[PDB]
Amino acid sequence: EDLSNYIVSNIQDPLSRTKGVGDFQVFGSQYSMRIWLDPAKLNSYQLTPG
Amino acid sequence: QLQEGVKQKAILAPQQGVTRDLKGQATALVVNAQNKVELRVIKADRVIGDKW
């Protein structure tokens, strides 16, 4: 996923500049700020994930 | 502003010397004994003045 972020970030924009490349399909996708909730520490402060 | 603790051997790196990688981990470059530059991923947590 780190390498797929590197592809989607900055070898995807110069690759479609070239004469002849139509649509394309990168493997994987870019990043996401992925948040890992802890259920015991959600219990500890009286919080639902909603 | 409470103060607790004191470090004996604390390594204070400047803010222009440590940056952020695209993954988010704080990185800072190091030159070696054979005079080449090299990258090691560090754990920068607090700021003191203008120094990580």
Sign of CA dihedral B21, B27, B28, B34: negative
Residues 6+ apart with CB under 8 A from A16: A24
Amino acid of residue B5:
G
**CA B30 to chain centroid:** 11
Provide Rg for chain B, Cα atoms.
13
Q: For B10-24, b where at least 16 C-beta lie within 10 A, e where not — what string?
A: eeeeeeeeeeeeeee
Give the separation between CA B31 and CA B39, rounded to whole angstroms: 9
B29 φ, ψ (degrees, to nearest 5): -85, 150
Give how far A33 is from chain B: nearest CA, Å: 10
To which H or E segment does residue B39 belong?
Answer: strand B37-41
Strands (DSSP E) along A1-50, which ranges? none
Taking an 8 Å cut-off on Cβ atoms, the answer to whether B23 and A9 are in contact is no
